[PDB]
From Swiss-Prot, chains A, B:
Its main location: cytoplasm. Belongs to the class-I pyridoxal-phosphate-dependent aminotransferase family. This is Kynurenine--oxoglutarate transaminase 1. One of its GO terms (molecular function) is cysteine-S-conjugate beta-lyase activity. The modification N6-(pyridoxal phosphate)lysine is found at K244. One of its GO terms (cellular component) is cytosol. Its EC number is 2.6.1.7, 4.4.1.13, 2.6.1.64. It catalyses: L-kynurenine + 2-oxoglutarate = kynurenate + L-glutamate + H2O; 3-phenylpyruvate + L-glutamine = 2-oxoglutaramate + L-phenylalanine; an S-substituted L-cysteine + H2O = a thiol + pyruvate + NH4(+). Catalyzes the irreversible transamination of the L-tryptophan metabolite L-kynurenine to form kynurenic acid (KA), an intermediate in the tryptophan catabolic pathway which is also a broad spectrum antagonist of the three ionotropic excitatory amino acid receptors among others. Also metabolizes the cysteine conjugates of certain halogenated alkenes and alkanes to form reactive metabolites. Catalyzes the beta-elimination of S-conjugates and Se-conjugates of L-(seleno)cysteine, resulting in the cleavage of the C-S or C-Se bond. InterPro entries: Aminotransferase_I/II_large, Kynurenine-oxoglutarate_AT, PyrdxlP-dep_Trfase, PyrdxlP-dep_Trfase_major, PyrdxlP-dep_Trfase_small. The lineage of its organism: Eukaryota, Metazoa, Chordata, Craniata, Vertebrata.
């Protein structure tokens, strides 16, 4: 073989496929998990300052992070986590939340280890486990009963304690937690986190916690970081994304926070893979966090204003999608909501596609080509054996400009007449 | 073990002790392998434009590269290599030349594979081979004869054809070629490349070619890309660095060029590790290459002016360093020259050090502390078994501001005249 065996079974990527398909048709693109409006002025200005300031910012910075960035990460997140964070020993700056995940898997996961992943899961957790020689083990959130003409809530998708406990074994190396969850929008409760924490402590397992949507919480729901829970700092790696934090996904800056005895291994991966992150975007992100720490909890701060604005976009989309019979599950956080399409599957089962092909994939192609709306089939966030059973949801992104939502409504009005 | 075994023996960075010692003293830092002056105005302005233009440049771009960048990389390097290059199939944008290297090793190198590495080598080739489960196989360039009258030339460090041929086995997966070479500054001749090409073809080996210093060639020496040789495109990966190209090392943008049947595997690694490179730095790099393509081979082009300027810096450093008995080997390319310190070893054989610490490492420490000049011991660019023999060279970087070269001369004045 030319190629390494570690690449077995991970050459296909759904986003590569889906982005190509959407670009081939005239659509309102609610599949894109990023803003189509500008980042806040302070953030764009921060990047402008970084590229017009000290000329030496054009040259390499320190391997484990631009010092002003590690300093503010350690200060701000130390406060949030109720933890003393050493910028040199407990912070690593990475190429996005994505690179941070990769660094964690490559540092800790070895041949034969099991990694527990919670369905629905941000799809990369599976192939990253595989590339590191790990065996993915899946626990599935249980959609709650929906009654009295109500919409479901993401909060009511349950992490069953018996199910979760049954997935832990002597071979479990890590559990991957994503809260707020992409694609579902669930914000894990203290009780749910205590369940995860108790089992990670009992089995001596590391929790890799993907908290990129930390600030995107709605309806009074509170983000809780599992690393802040008793006994968890010493066994947790906490991941964030500047892009998802500051509505600047193209900046691709992320970080991992955690204890030195774990972090030293991620540093080893980092020094042997990218070595440096870009200097100037780090400077921009540091300046942006400084601004938010200064205004923390104040009504003028982005972390207060932006979630409030996006909650209005969420509510708008929830109302609109119902007009054509899609059934939203109300999210408590993230950029996303999912809609149940089971009524469509029942009444329009015979959409064309491959003999094995999940209904949601076929529905999304139908909707793009005939209705001019893009969504993401939720089955890509499920293990293959479960895709045939979770093929009746699709994911929309509501973090969009007013004009995009109006364009969405135009499409929905046309559909509604065609029902 | 908490950590994965792939990290075995790759946690140490032998640079670090020198960076730390340098920071503790009043030094002229000729160890840093990057400019201490600004990038050219057109490059800095390109980045400024990218962060103050289309607001959507703040969001994600395409996974395998920002299209305007892959477009110009394909056209510009297609011309240079005499090769039809498709942006989508044959170009991958990466996190620097370093990320490009990592991506190639992770795609291709597997347990039980051998990788041929040419000494002195850019130090990461060894641990990257190790992390991917490969066995590094080392072949040393051998300096040709030079008398007490004249200086050696990098061109005269020879790759013995029969030595090289004997390194090849049924297990050889890749050969890593770095031209122009860091630390030595050798520019491989057409003859030397034809030899490498012949053995790679005979044994069905992939040539990973690190060409970050492409533009930094001196004394009328020409950069030849091995991928341009007959039959080589189908078995070569060619790596470049925006940072080394535009004197903007903190930008950390690189690329790999190659045939689809190999590139698809690097795409698999990429999509499962970083997914996106940052958008705006890619826009800046595209704009910078457009500028240089327009002015290709013209007197006003950076690719003509800059290496001419740096040749003058090289010449200044070669003369200056001889004042204290250092013996430069004249480089034909790169940012670097090495000096033989054998005369110091003879006169001052006993220097403070650890057990089996190579003389050059002890000498650099002595020089930093006592003379205020930083260099890099060349033994870090050798396999451990060969460090005993190649213990008497140190690396200087001459890509420095005129003020820095003046400051070098002040340190040399003090070395000669004081005490
Ligand atoms: O959920 C999203 O839309 C964001 C997203 C999709 N594929 C990705 C790959 C890398 C980083 C983020 C994403
Ligand atoms: O040779 C140099 O000084 C440049 C250099 C040393 N270590 C490095 C790691 C990544 C990228 C560049 C370098
Ligand atoms: Na255990
Ligand atoms: Na062979």
């Amino acid at each position: 073989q030319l190629q390494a065996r570690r690449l077995d079974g991970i050459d296909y990527n759904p986003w590569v496929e889906f982005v190509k398909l959407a670009s081939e048709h005239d659509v309102v693109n609610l599949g894109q998990g990023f803003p189509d409006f500008p980042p806040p002025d302070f953030a764009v200005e921060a990047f402008q300052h970084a590229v017009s300031g000290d000329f030496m910012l054009n040259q390499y910075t320190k391997t484990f992070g631009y010092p002003p960035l590690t300093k503010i990460l350690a200060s701000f997140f130390g406060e949030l986590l109720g933890q003393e964070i050493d910028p040199l020993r407990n912070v690593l700056v990475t190429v996005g939340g994505y690179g941070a995940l990769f660094t964690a898997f490559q540092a800790l996961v070895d041949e034969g280890d099991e990694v527990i992943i919670i369905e629905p899961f941000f799809d990369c957790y599976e192939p990253m486990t595989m590339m590191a020689g790990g065996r993915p083990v899946f626990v599935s959130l249980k959609p709650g009963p929906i009654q009295n003409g109500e919409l479901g809530s993401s909060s009511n998708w349950q992490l069953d304690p018996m199910e979760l406990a049954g997935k832990f074994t002597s071979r479990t190396k890590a559990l991957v937690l994503n809260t707020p969850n992409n694609p579902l929008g669930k914000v894990f409760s203290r009780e749910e986190l205590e369940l995860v924490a108790s089992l990670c402590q009992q089995h001596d397992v590391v929790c890799i916690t993907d908290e990129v949507y930390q600030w995107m919480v709605y309806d009074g729901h509170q983000h809780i970081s599992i690393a802040s829970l008793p006994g968890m700092w010493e066994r947790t790696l906490t991941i964030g994304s500047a892009g998802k934090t500051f509505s600047a996904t193209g900046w691709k800056v992320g970080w991992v926070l955690g204890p030195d005895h774990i972090m030293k291994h991620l540093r080893t991966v980092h020094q042997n893979s990218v070595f440096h992150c870009p200097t100037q975007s780090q400077a921009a992100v540091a300046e942006s966090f400084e601004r938010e720490q200064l205004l923390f909890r104040q009504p003028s701060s982005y972390f207060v204003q932006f979630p409030q604005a996006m909650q209005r976009c969420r509510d708008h989309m929830i109302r609109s999608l119902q007009s054509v019979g899609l059934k939203p599950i109300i999210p408590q956080g993230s950029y996303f909501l999912i809609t149940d399409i089971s009524d469509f599957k029942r009444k329009m089962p015979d959409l064309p596609g491959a003999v094995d092909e999940p209904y949601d994939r076929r529905f999304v192609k139908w909707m793009i080509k005939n209705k001019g709306l893009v969504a993401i089939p939720v089955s890509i966030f499920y293990s293959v054996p479960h895709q045939k059973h979770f093929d009746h949801y699709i994911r929309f992104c509501f973090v969009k400009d007013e004009a995009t939502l109006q364009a969405m409504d135009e499409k929905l009005r046309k559909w509604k007449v065609e029902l």
